[PDB]
Short mmCIF file of C-alpha atoms and ligand atoms in Angstrom, two decimals:
data_model
loop_
_atom_site.label_atom_id
_atom_site.label_comp_id
_atom_site.label_asym_id
_atom_site.label_seq_id
_atom_site.Cartn_x
_atom_site.Cartn_y
_atom_site.Cartn_z
CA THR A 1 -4.92 5.85 -5.79
CA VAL A 2 -1.36 5.31 -6.88
CA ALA A 3 0.68 8.43 -7.64
CA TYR A 4 4.24 8.38 -9.02
CA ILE A 5 6.54 11.10 -7.64
CA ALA A 6 9.96 12.09 -8.91
CA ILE A 7 12.64 13.14 -6.38
CA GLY A 8 15.74 14.97 -7.43
CA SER A 9 18.35 16.70 -5.31
CA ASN A 10 21.78 18.22 -5.64
CA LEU A 11 21.90 19.70 -2.15
CA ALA A 12 24.71 19.05 0.43
CA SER A 13 24.98 15.21 0.91
CA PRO A 14 22.13 14.18 -1.35
CA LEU A 15 21.81 10.73 0.16
CA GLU A 16 20.63 12.18 3.48
CA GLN A 17 18.50 14.77 1.61
CA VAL A 18 16.43 12.27 -0.34
CA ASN A 19 16.02 10.00 2.68
CA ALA A 20 14.62 13.06 4.49
CA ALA A 21 12.25 13.67 1.56
CA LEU A 22 11.14 10.01 1.54
CA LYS A 23 10.35 10.38 5.17
CA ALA A 24 8.28 13.43 4.54
CA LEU A 25 6.40 11.65 1.69
CA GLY A 26 5.37 8.83 3.99
CA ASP A 27 4.17 11.28 6.66
CA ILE A 28 1.67 12.79 4.24
CA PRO A 29 -1.86 12.20 5.53
CA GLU A 30 -3.91 9.39 4.10
CA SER A 31 -0.82 8.24 2.27
CA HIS A 32 1.86 5.58 2.41
CA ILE A 33 4.85 4.64 0.22
CA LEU A 34 4.40 1.58 -1.89
CA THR A 35 7.78 1.36 -3.57
CA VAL A 36 10.97 3.40 -4.10
CA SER A 37 13.42 3.07 -6.98
CA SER A 38 17.12 2.75 -6.76
CA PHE A 39 18.98 6.05 -6.62
CA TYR A 40 20.44 7.32 -9.85
CA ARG A 41 23.11 9.89 -10.77
CA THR A 42 22.78 12.88 -13.15
CA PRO A 43 25.94 14.82 -13.58
CA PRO A 44 25.72 18.61 -14.06
CA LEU A 45 26.60 20.37 -17.35
CA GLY A 46 30.11 21.75 -17.96
CA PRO A 47 33.47 20.73 -16.53
CA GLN A 48 33.06 22.94 -13.48
CA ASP A 49 33.21 21.47 -9.99
CA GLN A 50 29.51 20.99 -9.32
CA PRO A 51 27.52 18.36 -7.45
CA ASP A 52 25.70 15.47 -9.13
CA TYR A 53 21.93 15.25 -8.90
CA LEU A 54 20.40 12.25 -7.15
CA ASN A 55 17.24 11.02 -8.85
CA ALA A 56 14.54 8.59 -7.70
CA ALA A 57 10.94 7.63 -8.36
CA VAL A 58 8.40 6.77 -5.67
CA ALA A 59 5.07 4.96 -5.79
CA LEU A 60 2.73 6.60 -3.27
CA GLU A 61 -0.72 5.17 -2.45
CA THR A 62 -2.95 8.03 -1.46
CA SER A 63 -6.60 8.84 -0.95
CA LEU A 64 -5.91 12.64 -1.23
CA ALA A 65 -7.12 14.71 -4.16
CA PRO A 66 -4.38 15.48 -6.70
CA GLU A 67 -4.32 19.16 -5.83
CA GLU A 68 -4.11 18.17 -2.17
CA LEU A 69 -1.06 16.00 -2.93
CA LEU A 70 0.52 18.99 -4.62
CA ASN A 71 -0.03 21.12 -1.58
CA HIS A 72 2.04 18.61 0.37
CA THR A 73 4.85 18.22 -2.16
CA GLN A 74 5.12 21.98 -2.36
CA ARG A 75 5.24 22.22 1.39
CA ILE A 76 7.96 19.57 1.68
CA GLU A 77 10.10 21.39 -0.95
CA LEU A 78 9.91 24.55 1.03
CA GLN A 79 10.48 22.99 4.48
CA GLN A 80 13.32 20.79 3.29
CA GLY A 81 15.10 22.79 0.64
CA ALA A 82 17.04 26.02 0.57
CA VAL A 83 14.41 28.36 -0.71
CA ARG A 84 14.40 30.37 2.45
CA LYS A 85 18.13 30.48 3.01
CA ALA A 86 18.84 31.16 -0.60
CA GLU A 87 16.85 31.33 -3.87
CA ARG A 88 13.81 29.67 -5.35
CA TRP A 89 15.92 28.73 -8.33
CA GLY A 90 18.83 28.07 -5.96
CA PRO A 91 22.09 26.67 -7.26
CA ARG A 92 21.08 23.65 -5.18
CA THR A 93 17.58 22.30 -4.82
CA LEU A 94 15.13 19.67 -3.70
CA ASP A 95 12.61 18.82 -6.38
CA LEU A 96 9.43 16.75 -5.93
CA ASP A 97 7.27 16.45 -9.04
CA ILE A 98 4.01 14.63 -9.43
CA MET A 99 4.58 12.57 -12.56
CA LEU A 100 1.44 10.52 -12.61
CA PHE A 101 -1.79 10.34 -10.64
CA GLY A 102 -3.88 7.19 -11.11
CA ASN A 103 -4.78 7.12 -14.79
CA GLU A 104 -5.86 10.75 -14.55
CA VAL A 105 -5.22 13.50 -17.06
CA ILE A 106 -5.19 16.95 -15.43
CA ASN A 107 -4.81 20.14 -17.40
CA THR A 108 -4.83 23.23 -15.11
CA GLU A 109 -2.66 26.18 -14.47
CA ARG A 110 -1.35 25.00 -11.13
CA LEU A 111 -1.24 21.28 -11.95
CA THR A 112 -0.60 19.31 -15.24
CA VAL A 113 -0.68 15.51 -15.02
CA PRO A 114 1.16 13.67 -16.65
CA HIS A 115 4.12 15.95 -15.84
CA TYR A 116 4.59 18.00 -18.92
CA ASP A 117 8.10 16.90 -19.87
CA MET A 118 8.60 13.52 -18.23
CA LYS A 119 8.57 11.45 -21.44
CA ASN A 120 11.72 13.32 -22.44
CA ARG A 121 13.46 12.92 -19.11
CA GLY A 122 15.39 9.71 -18.75
CA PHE A 123 16.17 10.51 -15.09
CA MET A 124 12.44 10.27 -14.56
CA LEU A 125 11.61 7.40 -16.88
CA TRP A 126 14.30 4.92 -15.94
CA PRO A 127 13.58 4.97 -12.24
CA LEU A 128 9.87 4.73 -12.97
CA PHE A 129 10.46 1.77 -15.32
CA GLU A 130 12.31 0.09 -12.42
CA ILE A 131 9.28 0.27 -10.22
CA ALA A 132 6.54 0.04 -12.79
CA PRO A 133 7.76 -1.74 -15.95
CA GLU A 134 4.20 -2.39 -17.13
CA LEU A 135 3.13 1.21 -16.97
CA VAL A 136 0.84 2.59 -19.59
CA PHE A 137 0.23 6.39 -19.89
CA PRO A 138 -3.28 7.83 -20.23
CA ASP A 139 -2.85 8.57 -23.91
CA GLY A 140 -2.00 4.87 -24.50
CA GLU A 141 1.77 5.16 -24.78
CA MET A 142 3.60 2.23 -23.14
CA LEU A 143 6.60 3.13 -21.01
CA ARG A 144 8.60 0.17 -22.41
CA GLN A 145 8.20 1.36 -25.98
CA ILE A 146 9.30 4.93 -25.22
CA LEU A 147 12.47 3.57 -23.75
CA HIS A 148 13.18 1.57 -26.86
CA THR A 149 12.51 4.47 -29.20
CA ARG A 150 13.55 7.73 -27.48
CA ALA A 151 17.20 8.77 -26.99
CA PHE A 152 18.27 9.37 -23.39
CA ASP A 153 21.57 10.27 -21.79
CA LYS A 154 23.29 7.31 -20.11
CA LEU A 155 22.02 6.98 -16.52
CA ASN A 156 23.93 5.03 -13.90
CA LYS A 157 22.83 4.17 -10.36
CA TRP A 158 24.26 6.43 -7.57
CL1 CL B 201 -0.16 10.91 -21.53
#
């Protein structure tokens, strides 16, 4: 099964951080990376000196159950972020979100697939379109049409 995962990070030197994350994703059991997007850059809000977010999308082939994949992405966030040395909501973070899972539609308290807000997040859709231009969502929406009709903030490569 092909799952699409979004990586975002504003920690220390984000290049190294996401590379670390990519590594962790490949080391997930019964899983290997198919494709990774270019790295993109989302600036923070306000004029304040604050680090940019690095964004990417990954295509993961897995034979794990979706909840099982979430166990692992949750684990990697904790092992690799700052939640222990700081806060959950930390000024800086490592985010791994399961955007899509096969053509599956999952509606539960701990897991909602497709990711609830991804169609409104250009830092998720543009990297995804780079690696899967022909993608169709379970409800029939075509990724290419959403990008022609919805308004997204400019998004340059890192
Ligand atoms: Cl959908």
